[PDB]
C-alpha cells in the first residue's frame, strides 16, 4: 500500500499547485462508500491530455447511433460527424442507404452564414431532403453540436413542426459538446430524449401479445456482435428478448420495451436513468447482468432464471450443462499460457469492472483499473471486485498513466486507441478495450473463447521480445 501512495505522490509532484490538489483527489489505493476514497464526475484540468469525450460523443456515438432504422443528423459543422462516422463497432443487420443508416454521416455542414443568421430554416429543409432521399427511414434524431447550443437554435420547434407535417418521429437532442465534463451527460441527455419522444408512443396500444417470459436487454450496444452473443443464451433459456438497446436496435423495439416483464441492464452508467424511469412508471423490474467470462455468465444466468418459474431454471441448468465442456476446453487450452499475468485497465464507465471475472477465469490478476467518466456508484461497485492494495485512477492523464505503467510494469494494458501505440512503444502488450481490437465478440461463452485467444496472441506475441537491438 505504501509503495502505491509513494508512486502517487511522486507522479503528482509534477503538476502545478492547483492541478496537484485537484489530481490528488482522483487517485486512490483500493480498500475492498467510494466518496471517502475517490471523487469522480468532475471537470478535467486544462492542458493535461484527458481521454474523455463530449456529450455529443456520448449521445450520438453511444446511444442514438446504434439505432439502425433511424437517421441521425449531426447538426452543426462537419468535423464531429466525420470523426465519429463508423468509428464505433455497434454491429447491426440492414441494407445501408435503404433501411439502415448506422455507418452513414448525415450533417447540416454549417457555414458562417448559418452561424450568423441561424440554421432552423436549413434544418427544416434538411429534414425535407432526408425524407425525399431516404424514404424507408423510420425516424430522425437531431444531435446538436456546440454552436447549436451557443446560438440558441430552436430545434425543438422544428422537430415538432416537421414531425406533425410528415408524420414521423423527430427527436431533438441537446447534446452540445461543452455541456457536462464527459460523455456521461451525453448518455443522460440521450436517455431523457428517448423518454420524452420515443418510449411512450405505444402507451395506449394493447395490440402486442405479451408472455410471462418477456425480457429486454438494456444498454448493450452490440460491439463486435456482443449483444447477439448474449441474446442467444437468453433465448436458449426460454426467455423472449423483445428489445435491444441500442446495438442492432430498432425504434419499434424501444417502443415495445414498456411491455416486457424484466429489464436486464448491462451498462448501468449509460442506461440506468431509463431503467429507473421504466421501473417507476410502468412497474417493470430491472437488474444488472454480467456475461464476461464463464463464472459471471453462469451466475448471471442463474440470477436471471431465479426471477421466473421453474421451467426457466431447468432450461438454464440445461444451458449451463451444454456449454460447460466448451469453456472448460478453452480454459484448459489457454490458461497455462496466461496464469500469473498482470493487467492494467483504463476504459470508459462500465468495462473496467465487468471484464475482471473473465481475466480471473484465465488465472490473471488486475493490479490497476480506472474510469474515464464513471460516477461514485461505479466505484462503489468496483471496490469489491478489485484486489487489496491495488490502484484506482479517475480521469487519468497521459503523464500519470505513463508514469504509473512505468513503475508498476504490468504484463498487459487494456485501454483505448489514444494510448495503444503509446504503450506499444514502451514494450508492453496492449489490447483495445473499446473496439475489442477489431475482434470479438467477448460476451457469453462464445465470446470467452475469442477473449482467451486474443489475450494469448497479444501477451505471448514474439514481437515484444525484439525491442532491443542486439548491439545495444
Amino acid at each position: 500500500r505504501e509503495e502505491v501512495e509513494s508512486l502517487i505522490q511522486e507522479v503528482l509532484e509534477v503538476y502545478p499547485e492547483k492541478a496537484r490538489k485537484d489530481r490528488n483527489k482522483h487517485l486512490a489505493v483500493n480498500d475492498p462508500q467510494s466518496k471517502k476514497c475517490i471523487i469522480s464526475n468532475k471537470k478535467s484540468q486544462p492542458g493535461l491530455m484527458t481521454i474523455r469525450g463530449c456529450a455529443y460523443a456520448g449521445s450520438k456515438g453511444v446511444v442514438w447511433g446504434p439505432i439502425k432504422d433511424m437517421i441521425h443528423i449531426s447538426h452543426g459543422p462537419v468535423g464531429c460527424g466525420q470523426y465519429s462516422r463508423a468509428g464505433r463497432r455497434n454491429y447491426y443487420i440492414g441494407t445501408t442507404g435503404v433501411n439502415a443508416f448506422v455507418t452513414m454521416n448525415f450533417t447540416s455542414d454549417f457555414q458562417e452564414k448559418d452561424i450568423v443568421f441561424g440554421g432552423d430554416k436549413k434544418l427544416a429543409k434538411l429534414i425535407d431532403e432526408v425524407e425525399t432521399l431516404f424514404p424507408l427511414n423510420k425516424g430522425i434524431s437531431v444531435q446538436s453540436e456546440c454552436p447549436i447550443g451557443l446560438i440558441g437554435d430552436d430545434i425543438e420547434s422544428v422537430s415538432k413542426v416537421k414531425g406533425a407535417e410528415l408524420s414521423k418521429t423527430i427527436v431533438p437532442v441537446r447534446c452540445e459538446g461543452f455541456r457536462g465534463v464527459s460523455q456521461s451527460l451525453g448518455h443522460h441527455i440521450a436517455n431523457d430524449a428517448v423518454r420524452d419522444w420515443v418510449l411512450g408512443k405505444r402507451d395506449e396500444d394493447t395490440t402486442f401479445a405479451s408472455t410471462p417470459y418477456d425480457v429486454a436487454i438494456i444498454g448493450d450496444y452490440n460491439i463486435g456482435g456482443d449483444a447477439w452473443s448474449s441474446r442467444i443464451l437468453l433465448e436458449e433459456m426460454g426467455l423472449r428478448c423483445v428489445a435491444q438497446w441500442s446495438g442492432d436496435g430498432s425504434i419499434s423495439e424501444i417502443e415495445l420495451t414498456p411491455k416486457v416483464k424484466l429489464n436486464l441492464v448491462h451498462c448501468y452508467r449509460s442506461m440506468n436513468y431509463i431503467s429507473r424511469h421504466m421501473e417507476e412508471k410502468y412497474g417493470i423490474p430491472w437488474m444488472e447482468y454480467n456475461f464476461f467470462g464463464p463464472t459471471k455468465t453462469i451466475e448471471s444466468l442463474r440470477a436471471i432464471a431465479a426471477k421466473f418459474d421453474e421451467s426457466i431454471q431447468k432450461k438454464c441448468e440445461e444451458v449451463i450443462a451444454k456449454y460447460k465442456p466448451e469453456w472448460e476446453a478453452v480454459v484448459a487450452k489457454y490458461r497455462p499460457r496466461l496464469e500469473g499475468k498482470r493487467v492494467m485497465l483504463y476504459i470508459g464507465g462500465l468495462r473496467p469492472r465487468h471484464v475482471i471475472g473473465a481475466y480471473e477465469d484465465l488465472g490473471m490478476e488486475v493490479v490497476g483499473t480506472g474510469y474515464e467518466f464513471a460516477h461514485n456508484d461505479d466505484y462503489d461497485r468496483t471496490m469489491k471486485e478489485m484486489g487489496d492494495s491495488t490502484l484506482l485512477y479517475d480521469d487519468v492523464t497521459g503523464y500519470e498513466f505513463e508514469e504509473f505503467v512505468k513503475r508498476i510494469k504490468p504484463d498487459l494494458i487494456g485501454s483505448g486507441i489514444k494510448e495503444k501505440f503509446i504503450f506499444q512503444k514502451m514494450g508492453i502488450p496492449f489490447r483495445e478495450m473499446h473496439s475489442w481490437d477489431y475482434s470479438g465478440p467477448y460476451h457469453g461463452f462464445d465470446g470467452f473463447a475469442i477473449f482467451a485467444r486474443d489475450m494469448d496472441m497479444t501477451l505471448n506475441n514474439p514481437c515484444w521480445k525484439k525491442l532491443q537491438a542486439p548491439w545495444e
Binding site: 458562417e112 452564414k113 452561424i115 450568423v116 443568421f117 441561424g118 432552423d120 454552436p147 451557443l150 446560438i151
Partner: protein, 270 residues
C-alpha cells in the same frame, strides 16, 4: 490615423453623438470613416442620408463568403466626404451577431480599408456588449481610443462602470486606452454631480458635455446631422466644441473600475 471606439449604455445616443461629431470633424479638414457594431445597422443613416440596406453580412450571404465580397460594394461617401460602412447581421432573436462583427472587421482588415489617408476611424458599438465579438474594436491593432458615452442617470453610469470592467482585460493585454467620458443629458440633477465624480473615480475626465437639445431629434427626423440641418445653432456649436476636444485629447489612462458599493455611496454623495 486615430482609430477610436464609441462605447456606452444602449440608447444613450452613441450614433447620434458619433455622427454629429464626425460631421463636425468633417468640414473641419479631416477625413473619417464610421464602422458600426450592432446588427440593427443604422449608425451611418445621418451621414448616408438614408438607411443602408447594404451591409457586409447580407452581401456576404448573397455572394456566399466574405472572400467574394469586394470592398467598393459596402463603402460609401456622405456629408463632408465621410466614408461609411455598415456591416449588419440577423434580425432579433436569431443567429449570432457577434460572429458577424468578427467576420466584418476581419474583412475590413483583409480588404484594404483602413490604409487610406483618413484621420479617424470611428467604431460605434451597441450598448449590450454581450460577447467577445462585440469587443473586436478594442482588440490589438484595432481602435486605440475609447470614449464611453453616458448620461447623468444612474443606470448609464452603472453601464459605464461595467464597460470599464470589461475593457480592463483588453487594456492590460494591449494598448487601447480610455480617452474620456462623453456626457449626454437626460435633464437630471447630475451634470457634474456624478459625472466628474465617476470620471475622477475612473481616473478619467469628462470630455465636454452635450445637453438635451431638442434640435437633435428634429434633425434626426430630417435624416440630418445638426450642423447640416441648422449649421448656425447652439447644438452645432456644441458639436464643433466636442470635435475640438476629440482633436486634442491626450488623457489616455487605463480605466480603474470602482466597485458597486462605491457607486451606491456616490449616488447619495451627490
Amino acid at each position: 490615423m486615430r482609430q477610436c471606439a464609441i462605447y456606452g449604455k444602449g440608447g444613450i445616443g452613441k450614433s447620434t453623438t458619433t455622427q454629429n461629431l464626425v460631421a463636425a470633424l468633417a468640414e473641419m479638414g479631416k477625413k473619417v470613416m464610421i464602422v458600426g457594431c450592432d446588427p440593427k445597422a443604422d449608425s451611418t443613416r445621418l451621414i448616408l442620408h438614408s438607411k443602408a440596406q447594404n451591409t457586409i453580412m447580407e452581401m456576404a450571404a448573397e455572394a456566399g463568403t466574405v472572400e467574394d465580397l469586394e470592398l467598393e460594394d459596402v463603402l460609401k461617401a456622405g456629408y463632408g466626404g465621410v466614408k461609411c460602412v455598415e456591416s449588419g447581421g440577423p434580425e432579433p432573436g436569431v443567429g449570432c451577431a457577434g460572429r458577424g462583427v468578427i467576420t466584418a472587421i476581419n474583412f475590413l482588415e483583409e480588404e484594404g480599408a483602413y490604409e487610406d489617408d483618413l484621420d479617424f476611424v470611428f467604431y460605434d458599438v451597441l450598448g449590450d456588449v454581450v460577447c467577445g465579438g462585440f469587443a473586436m474594436p478594442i482588440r490589438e491593432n484595432k481602435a486605440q481610443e475609447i470614449y464611453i458615452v453616458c448620461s447623468g442617470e444612474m443606470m448609464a453610469m452603472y453601464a459605464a462602470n461595467n464597460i470599464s470592467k470589461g475593457i480592463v482585460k483588453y487594456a492590460n493585454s494591449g494598448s487601447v486606452r480610455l480617452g474620456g467620458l462623453i456626457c449626454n443629458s437626460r435633464n437630471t440633477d447630475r451634470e457634474d454631480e456624478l459625472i466628474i465624480a465617476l470620471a475622477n473615480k475612473l481616473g478619467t475626465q469628462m470630455i465636454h458635455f452635450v445637453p438635451r437639445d431638442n434640435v437633435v431629434q428634429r434633425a434626426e427626423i430630417r435624416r440630418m446631422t445638426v450642423i447640416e440641418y441648422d449649421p448656425k445653432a447652439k447644438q452645432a456649436d456644441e458639436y464643433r466644441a466636442l470635435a475640438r476636444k476629440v482633436v486634442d485629447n491626450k488623457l489616455l489612462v487605463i480605466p480603474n473600475p470602482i466597485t458597486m458599493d462605491e457607486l451606491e455611496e456616490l449616488l447619495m454623495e451627490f
